Each structure stands twice: as structure tokens, then as C-alpha cells.
Amino acid sequence: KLRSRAWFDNPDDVDMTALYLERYMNYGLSQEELQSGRPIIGIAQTGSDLSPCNRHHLELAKRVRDGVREAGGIVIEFPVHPIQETGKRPTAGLDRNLAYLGLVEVLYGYPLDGVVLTIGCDKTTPACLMAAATVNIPAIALSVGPMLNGWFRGERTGSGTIVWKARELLAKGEIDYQGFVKLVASSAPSTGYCNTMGTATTMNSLAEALGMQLPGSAAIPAPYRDRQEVAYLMGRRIVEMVHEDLKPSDILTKEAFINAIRVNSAIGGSTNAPIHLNALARHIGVELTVDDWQKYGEEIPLLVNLQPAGEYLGEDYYHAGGVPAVVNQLMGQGLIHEDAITVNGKTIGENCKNATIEDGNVIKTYDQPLKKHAGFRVLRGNLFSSAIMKLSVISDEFRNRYLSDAKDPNAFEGKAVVFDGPEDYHHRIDDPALEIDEHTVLFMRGAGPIGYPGAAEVVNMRAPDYLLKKGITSLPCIGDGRQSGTSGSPSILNASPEAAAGGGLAILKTGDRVRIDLGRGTADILISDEELAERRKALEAVGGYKYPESQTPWQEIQRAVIGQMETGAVLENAVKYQDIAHTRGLP
């Protein structure tokens, strides 16, 4: 019944059994350990020098080993392909699908009965969970946790968030280029990932909300001894999960994805969460669209008072009660599917029914929330088939300026300024010839999965310095790229199809009038449908949208099969491989 026995204890094939035993005993494992029906537990290790965010997982694996051994298993630790958001060029999103490919190969083709997935930095959570979904042997995820709180002259400084606030304090002469480095260094005072509500905190929280972590695990800061005890408890549990055959497909049900969509809104989750969870849904065989994110999550209020939306940081999120406290608030409104089973063998409802808010400054009750209507809205129209807007970081300046007109409520119109990539933007934003005022919507195209190739976090553009000196902070930002989860920009992201894939962004000229109507969920460049096909005819004639040639073999290989962000930016030909450890391997 244990698939590892086909390698280490196969009486029908004496020759090959002796071959695997010989190699896997050369650092002291005994024949009896490998031939006594003990679960072989992989640790999918994401920590290294090259991934500082996840590096503490090298130490946490020691506690995992204690739990596995004690429970009767054997650990085989092995590496996941490196991903690092602050490091990989041109973009670390290029590499989520590559790490997925390799991890599928290890889980499928080696004698592993179960796996501990070490998650942390932005894309390691989906890469690990996607591969676990495809192979579908029992799997449990362990967050490494955020860095400790940053401290600067008595105030909390958040990683990532302090950058966008210092990039406006530097571009206004109020901060030099040397003290800019000190204010940023203060925000990374320990090991762990981003300590704001960035993509990493989002995805690790959602991994718990999905049922893939022990309750309370996601929020624990990396240097806390609580993280080390949880690592041990997961080592014990994954062995029992093997005996129970508790698989990702048993846990990652539609109602688990619904719980995660609603927790995402309540915690202020990143605009990257729909990309990664739609990816995961497809790889486990559950249907989940961008429209589901609006349907289940748009009207959920924001409860977690964390930067960039709020004031506090990861340590405070943990002390306040973390994911269980958030789930418990949603349970009080009947907005949690409480019977969804989780890795610890209990339902999310049983795990969270007694979770209280332990700090009311950091986590708000549902009825007195931090902000209402904090989910995602999907915008459609001639600009793109889908894009989403981060409603949780709309400020009162943005609300009072743009969303306050009696002629057209919850809607605005303005002039469009288009940049073709982040380099084009960084060379034209401060250019006074552009005449960027209070009625301008900046566009960023060519930054999607195929165009960049990435996709890259380049949409949260800053206003020109002649507008930031007058007092205009945030401006409408729309693009076919992404943004950092730590961004407090209420941008219109993830436009699908991208420009390089025939999206309407490809034919937008700077100076065209555009109308973003959040009420009717539309996003159109105000032009003729006749002139629309004329711009597209001239495009196909002069060769399609222009974007850089591939620079590596993987760039080229991935560009030929990758789909759009709307559906997870997955390798499209990989999705047919379902439950491959048990369906012999699938089409």
C-alpha cells in the first residue's frame, strides 16, 4: 500500500531493489529502516543562501525530522528549484512554473509516500502546492514566517512598504540616497519573509485557510520558538496523514477555495492571490475563475490592520490571533464553509471555533471592520477580457477625488498615458512634456506572462515629481502586469489577455480617453468599434505587439505553453496531468 515499497522492498524485482537499497544506505540508513513499511517522507526544502526569505527552513527541518522519526517515518530532504522575489531577474514569476515542473518530477519519480512542503517567499507557496496537487500524495505545508517588526525612531517599518514610502520621500528631496538605505535596512531585522501584508504573508495565510497547514501556523514569525514547535508537530502529522491517505485532493475542494477567497479579503490579501489560487485550482481539478473572486469575496470587509493598508506588522498579526481569529470572525457571519477538512484531520470550523481576537488594534471584528467592501472587482471591456482592482487600499484621497462625482458615481474618465514596460515608464514619468494632472490614468503594457516574460510587479507606478510636490500622491494605475502585495496602490492589475497576447492594451494610444466604471464593472477606451479593428489590422500587418526575444532556453520553452494570468499563468499542457501518483500518470 505504501508506494515507496516498489523501490525499497519489491520481491518481484530482486535486482533493482538491491540497487536502490545500496545507494540509500551509504550514509548509514539500515536495510531494516528501508524495508519495514515505514512512510518515506520528503521534505521539499526551499531554503538556501540564494533564497534569504526561506533560508530558516534549513534549521526548521531539524524539528520536522524529530516529528517524522518519532511517528515512525523516514525523512528524505531534497531541494526545490530556487525562487526569490527580491533577487531573480528579470522576474521571479518566470520561475514558479519551473520549480513546479521539477517538484512534480521528484514527488512522482522517487520513493516518497508523503511530503512536507516548506513554503515562504511569494511564489514558493503556489509552486509547492501546485506540484503537490498534480502528484497528489499526502502533503502538508509549513510556513517559515515573517521577519520581526522593523523599528525606526519608535515606529514600525515594514519591508516593501517602507520602500514605496521612502521612494516618495527620496524623490521629494526630503531623503538623500544614503539615509534611504538605512531606513530600508531597518525593516529587515531578522530571517523570514516580508513582514507586511505582502504576497508572502497573503499566500502563507491562504495556505492555512485552504486547509494545508496546522491551525495557527501561518502567522508565526520565523525566529519564534513557536515556529520550531509547529515544525515538529507537522513532522508527526504528515506520517499519520500517510496512514490515513489524506491527500491534497481531499482537502483542496471548492469550498476550501471559497474559504480562502473570503479570508483573503478579510486580511487584505495581495492581488497575486487570484493568480496563484486559480493555478492551484486547475492543478487539483477544481473550477475557479476570477469571477469567483468577486462573487465570493468582493463584499467581505477588511479586518486585519496591517501595513500597507494599515499600521501593524507580522508579529502583531500573530499576537492578535492570526488566521484562526480571522476565520472565527467570518464564521460568526456564517461566511465560512466550516466542514472543510484540513491537514490536521479536523475541519476548519473545529480548528477555529474558539479562536479569539487577542489584540483589537490589529484585528477588527466583522461588525466594526477596518474597511467595508474590501475584496476584488473584475473589470471587463475593450481594454481586456479581465482585470482586478484592489479595493482594500483605496485611500480617502483616491475615494474623494475619483469616486465622488454626481454625474457618474463610482466612475471616472481621464487622459491615458501608456508606457511600454518599466524602462519606458522610468524614462517618461517625470518628463514635464507629458503634462500629467489630476485627470490622467497611467497604463503599463507589455508586462504580462509572455511579454516581460514574468509577469513583473511594475503597475504600482508613482506620480511625477511635479505632482508629488504639489500634493497628488496616488493616481489610477492600469496594466497587464502585477504589483507587489506590499503596495497600497489601488491599481487595476492582471489584465488578460496581455498586450503580447492580443489584449486591447496592445492598440491603446497615449491621449485616448478611457472610462473606468467600477459600478458597471467596465473598462473601455472611448473609441469606435470600427476604429478598434483598424488599429488591430495595422498591428497584425506590421507584425504583432513588440516584446523582447527570449534570453534563455526556459524563457522560450515556457512562452510556448504558458496561459494568461486570468487562469493562473500555468503551463497549459500541464493541467491535464491529474492525480498522477494514482491514475498511473494521466494523459
Instruction: Determine if 373 is a binding residue for a copy of itself (CB under 8 A).
Output: no
Of residues 79 and 544, the one with the C-beta less far from a copy of itself: 79
Of residues 167 and 535, the one with the C-beta less far from a copy of itself: 167
Q: By C-alpha distance, which of 497, 480, 439 is closest to 463?
A: 439
How far is residue 471's CA from residue 506's CA, in Å, rounded to a whole number? 32
Instruction: Determine if 179 is a binding residue for a copy of itself (CB under 8 A).
Output: no
Number of residues that bind a copy of itself (CB under 8 A): 111
Residue type, 157: T
Alpha carbon distances (Å) from 316 to 159, 270, 307? 15, 19, 11
The SS3 assignment for 264 reads: helix
Segment near Zn ion (CB under 5 A); pick from 83-91, 201-209, 253-261, 384-392? 83-91
| Residue 188 interacts with which of Cl ion, a copy of itself, Zn ion, none, CB < 5 to 8 Å by class | a copy of itself
**Cell, residue 516:** 473606468
Cβ of residue 7: shortest distance to a copy of itself, in angstroms?
Answer: 8
How far is residue 488's CA from residue 467's CA, in Å, rounded to a whole number? 18
Instruction: Determine if 129 is a binding residue for a copy of itself (CB under 8 A).
Output: no
Segment near Zn ion (CB under 5 A); pick from 26-34, 114-122, 149-157, 545-553? 114-122
Query: Quick one: DSSP state of residue 218?
Result: T
Residue type, 8: F
Instruction: Determine if 170 is a binding residue for a copy of itself (CB under 8 A).
Output: yes
Residue type, 42: G
**Cell, residue 347:** 475541519
Instruction: Determine if 168 is a binding residue for a copy of itself (CB under 8 A).
Output: no
Instruction: Determine if 36 is a binding residue for a copy of itself (CB under 8 A).
Output: no
Ranges within 65-104 binding Cl ion (CB under 5 A): 77, 79
Residue type, 277: L
Among 61, 80, 121, 129, binds Zn ion (CB under 5 A): 121
Instruction: Determine if 473 is a binding residue for Cl ion (CB under 5 A).
Output: no
| Residue 411 interacts with which of Cl ion, a copy of itself, Zn ion, none, CB < 5 to 8 Å by class | none
Instruction: Determine if 53 is a binding residue for Zn ion (CB under 5 A).
Output: yes
Alpha carbon distances (Å) from 397 to 211, 368, 471, 476? 38, 22, 10, 12
Segment near a copy of itself (CB under 8 A); pick from 52-60, 264-272, 290-298, 494-502? 52-60
Cβ of residue 39: shortest distance to a copy of itself, in angstroms?
Answer: 13
Among 187, 213, 278, 440, binds a copy of itself (CB under 8 A): 187
Query: Quick one: DSSP state of residue 440?
Result: E
Instruction: Determine if 124 is a binding residue for a copy of itself (CB under 8 A).
Output: no
Of residues 124 and 149, the one with the C-beta less far from Cl ion: 149
Q: Which residues of 161-177 are buried (b: 16+ CB within 10 A; e: fewer)?
A: bbbbbbebbbbeeebee
Number of residues that bind Cl ion (CB under 5 A): 5
Give the x/- contact pattern for Zn ion in 174-193, rule: CB under 5 A: -------------------x
Check if the beta carbon of residue 480 is closer than 8 Å to that of residue 505. Answer: yes
Annotated binding site for Zn(2+): 53, 121-122
Give the x/- contact pattern for Cl ion in 147-176, rule: CB under 5 A: --x---------------------------
Cβ of residue 536: shortest distance to a copy of itself, in angstroms?
Answer: 28
Of residues 120 and 481, the one with the C-beta less far from Zn ion: 120
Q: Which residues of 208-223 are buried (b: 16+ CB within 10 A; e: fewer)?
A: bbbbbbbbbbbbbbbb
How far is residue 123's CA from residue 204's CA, in Å, rounded to a whole number? 10
Element (DSSP H or E) covering residue 419: strand 411-420
| Residue 22 interacts with which of a copy of itself, Zn ion, Cl ion, none, CB < 5 to 8 Å by class | a copy of itself
Alpha carbon distances (Å) from 21 to 8, 32, 33, 37, 335? 6, 10, 10, 14, 51
Neighbours of 70 (CB within 10 A): 12
Contact set with Cl ion (CB under 5 A): 45, 48, 77, 79, 149
Contact set with Zn ion (CB under 5 A): 53, 85, 121, 193
